[PDB]
Amino acid sequence: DMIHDAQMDYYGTRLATCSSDRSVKIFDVRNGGQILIADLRGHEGPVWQVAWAHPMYGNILASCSYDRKVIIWREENGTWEKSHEHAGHDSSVNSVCWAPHDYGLILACGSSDGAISLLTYTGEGQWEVKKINNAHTIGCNAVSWAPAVVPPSGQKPNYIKRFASGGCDNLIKLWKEEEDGQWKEEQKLEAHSDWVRDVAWAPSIGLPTSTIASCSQDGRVFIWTCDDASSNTWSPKLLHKFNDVVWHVSWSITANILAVSGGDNKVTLWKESVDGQWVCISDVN
Amino acid sequence: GEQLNGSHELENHQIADSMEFGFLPNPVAVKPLESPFKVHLEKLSLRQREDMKLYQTPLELKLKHSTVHVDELCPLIVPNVAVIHDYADWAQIVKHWSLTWTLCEALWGHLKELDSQLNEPREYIQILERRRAFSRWLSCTATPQIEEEVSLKNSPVEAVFSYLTGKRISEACSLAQQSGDHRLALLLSQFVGSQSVRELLTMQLVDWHQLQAFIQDERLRIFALLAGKPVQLSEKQINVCSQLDWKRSLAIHLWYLLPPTASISRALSMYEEAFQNPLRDVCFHLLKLYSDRHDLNQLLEPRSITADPLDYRLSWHLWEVLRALNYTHLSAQCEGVLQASYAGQLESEGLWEWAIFVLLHIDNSGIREKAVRELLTRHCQLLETPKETFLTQKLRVPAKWIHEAKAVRAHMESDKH
Numbered sequence A: 001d002m003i004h005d006a007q008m009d010y011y012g013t014r015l016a017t018c019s020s021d022r023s024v025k026i027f028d029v030r031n032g033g034q035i036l037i038a039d040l041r042g043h044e045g046p047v048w049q050v051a052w053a054h055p056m057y058g059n060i061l062a063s064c065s066y067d068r069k070v071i072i073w074r075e076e077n078g079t080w081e082k083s084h085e086h087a088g089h090d091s092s093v094n095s096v097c098w099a100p101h102d103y104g105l106i107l108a109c110g111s112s113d114g115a116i117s118l119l120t121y122t123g124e125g126q127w128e129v130k131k132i133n134n135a136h137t138i139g140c141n142a143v144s145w146a147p148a149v150v151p152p153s154g155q156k157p158n159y160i161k162r163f164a165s166g167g168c169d170n171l172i173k174l175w176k177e178e179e180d181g182q183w184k185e186e187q188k189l190e191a192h193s194d195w196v197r198d199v200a201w202a203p204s205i206g207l208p209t210s211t212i213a214s215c216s217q218d219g220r221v222f223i224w225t226c227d228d229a230s231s232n233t234w235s236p237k238l239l240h241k242f243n244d245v246v247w248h249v250s251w252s253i254t255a256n257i258l259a260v261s262g263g264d265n266k267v268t269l270w271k272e273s274v275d276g277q278w279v280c281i282s283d284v285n
Numbered sequence B: 001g002e003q004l005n006g007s008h009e010l011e012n013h014q015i016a017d018s019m020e021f022g023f024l025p026n027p028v029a030v031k032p033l034e035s036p037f038k039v040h041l042e043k044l045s046l047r048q049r050e051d052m053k054l055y056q057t058p059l060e061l062k063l064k065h066s067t068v069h070v071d072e073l074c075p076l077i078v079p080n081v082a083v084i085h086d087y088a089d090w091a092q093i094v095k096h097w098s099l100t101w102t103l104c105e106a107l108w109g110h111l112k113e114l115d116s117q118l119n120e121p122r123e124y125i126q127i128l129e130r131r132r133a134f135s136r137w138l139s140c141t142a143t144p145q146i147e148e149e150v151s152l153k154n155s156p157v158e159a160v161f162s163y164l165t166g167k168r169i170s171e172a173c174s175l176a177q178q179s180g181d182h183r184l185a186l187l188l189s190q191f192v193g194s195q196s197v198r199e200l201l202t203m204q205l206v207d208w209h210q211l212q213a214f215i216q217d218e219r220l221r222i223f224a225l226l227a228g229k230p231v232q233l234s235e236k237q238i239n240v241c242s243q244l245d246w247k248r249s250l251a252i253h254l255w256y257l258l259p260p261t262a263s264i265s266r267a268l269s270m271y272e273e274a275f276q277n278p279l280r281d282v283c284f285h286l287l288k289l290y291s292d293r294h295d296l297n298q299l300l301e302p303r304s305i306t307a308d309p310l311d312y313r314l315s316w317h318l319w320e321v322l323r324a325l326n327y328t329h330l331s332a333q334c335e336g337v338l339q340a341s342y343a344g345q346l347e348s349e350g351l352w353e354w355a356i357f358v359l360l361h362i363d364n365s366g367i368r369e370k371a372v373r374e375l376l377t378r379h380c381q382l383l384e385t386p387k388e389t390f391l392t393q394k395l396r397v398p399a400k401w402i403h404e405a406k407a408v409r410a411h412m413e414s415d416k417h
Helices: B002-013 B056-065 B096-108 B121-151 B157-166 B169-179 B182-188 B197-208 B217-227 B246-256 B264-274 B282-291 B296-304 B312-325 B332-349 B352-359 B365-384 B388-396 B399-413
Strands: A003-008 A014-019 A023-029 A034-041 A047-052 A061-065 A070-073 A082-086 A095-098 A107-110 A116-121 A127-129 A174-177 A183-187 A196-200 A211-216 A220-225 A238-241 A246-251 A258-262 A267-272 A278-283 B020-022 B028-030 B040-042
Touching (some): A014 A047, A023 A047, A047 A095, A070 A107, A082 A127, A196 A246, A220 A258, A238 A278, A267 B028, B056 B388, B096 B121, B121 B157, B121 B264, B157 B246, B246 B264, B246 B282, B296 B332, B312 B332, B332 B352, B332 B365, B352 B365, B365 B388
Parallel strands (some): A246 B020
Antiparallel strands (some): A070 A082, A211 A220, A220 A238, A258 A267
8 A cells, every 4th residue: 555665776776665564575677667576574563664785795675663673684596585683672663774884784773662773793693782772762763874984004994983863852863883882872953843753864975064864743854064074063954844744854865965755745856055055956746 | 453553553653654765876766656666766857958968979079088197096187178169069059058158168268379470479369369259259149139220220320330339340431431421431440440549539529528519429429439448438338238238238348448458358357347247147157257367266156156057067167178278277176066066967867977977077086086986886787888888987997996896796696706
């Protein structure tokens, strides 16, 4: 009936999907034509968001759900079996996301109980889970990774490993992997008057002016900005407000165009003008 | 129970639904209920709007002009011979777009003087040539406007004036001769003469506007022209501004202002200071940029934050030619910003090869590397198939980078080595 989230594969070859019928379908789009390939069923409740891991680790795809469990489906010659499962949270799991391929193969999941698990991968079918309790007050909805940024020796750098995240408390808390081993909330961002729906960490076009977008029940979209590296300054700026809720927000790769999904079943595109004010480039559909 | 159960889930979730995120090669997908997947592969609209760009051959030809020197690590454009002139072939002569490129060329593109000369006067000769071409071109645009007006004019004298706007001295002189305005005819030939005759003439005008109970309106206008300062003097053809094209008036200044005393740029500036032009007019802004020679960049930013007459592509092309040419100086950062969105606009089009090429002209090495790298691997499949596309990787993509992306493709492909 109604799908929730669906994301294209890297190298634009597949297209995983999931709807409230608890079915994770992986289609294939060669030439523009859709063609199913498997219907990974396994959640006691509707699937929420879904994310493809980086081809550098073979072919992996994880899906979270209202069943409080998250699944990771590997692939070995067409063998789409699940190599690991994780039910570390008590309430539904609104979102998942993968850490930039350099950190390794880390997966971030925000539940509705107000927590956040982080599955790191080891040599074999093993997965450690550094968890964050009471991260948000009433639960969490969004989880986005901060772009992998590189900081005289034979070493792969230690990254700042940050990742933002909105929730039901209206706060968009940023986070960071403390040199010792656990994450801590580097900062809070309270600009929304109701539930934060989604939070997307725009990719850095090599540019140091890292941005982040958010949309919430109030129907406003903010593009929080940081003027320089290392200054704990996030100055929100209003994109627009619709009389209805905004459900999703995503960044287009090159221009940094924002796809604003929400309001009237309509989706909008925005590009920040040479003036600084954001505009609607067109109406989709 | 299922029905009740479902409603149970929705309220707590506070669920209402619509979803959209960017796809990896920047497209957009939203929920179609009509497609079978329930996702729609949206072709992101392309802001970039230009026929030749799609065509692969222009990109290839464009590459030959550029000389790519390595950066230290990556590529980077070093000599570049891009000219606005080049674009013209790939454009309708009629199209206004062609007009912008053409005019930009006449002003901006370097002019070559075949004849050998002593030296310093070469600059002098070169300016005349450029001035000659530029003034000639303006006459082309003005021509229908002028001719229409002359056809309606019910006088002999006014047209003689009108021909002058046409920049045709001889015809005006002839008409004057025919009209019996013998004296005026002789004076007319003076036009195109920077001669100091201007002063005597201004004197005549002064004497007149200090008594002169009667002088023909048009005769005075002709005198205003020979004076050399048509719109900056007392007995101004400023009022004419409502009547004629701003361009038409500009020509008069260019043609009679005082060609020798001032440079083409300063002279144009001289005219521009007098009249304010539509901000939106592209052709007009170009003159500003041309005239603004001393703060070209400074003007550019305000042109940017005013109107969008300049397309994204043009801005980039303009910056690049001027920079390579040493015609003007522009901010490295400003130059890059210009490049980035162009590179992006191309990417949205799906013209990855062309988009990569542009990325090359990026001053920032760090940004370049990231931008080119990210694109190469993601897109590596398409880049391989043609020689034109072959040449692209051939530009200066590092070998490691090419195969490296290729390797990733294999793991995904499940056929490795």
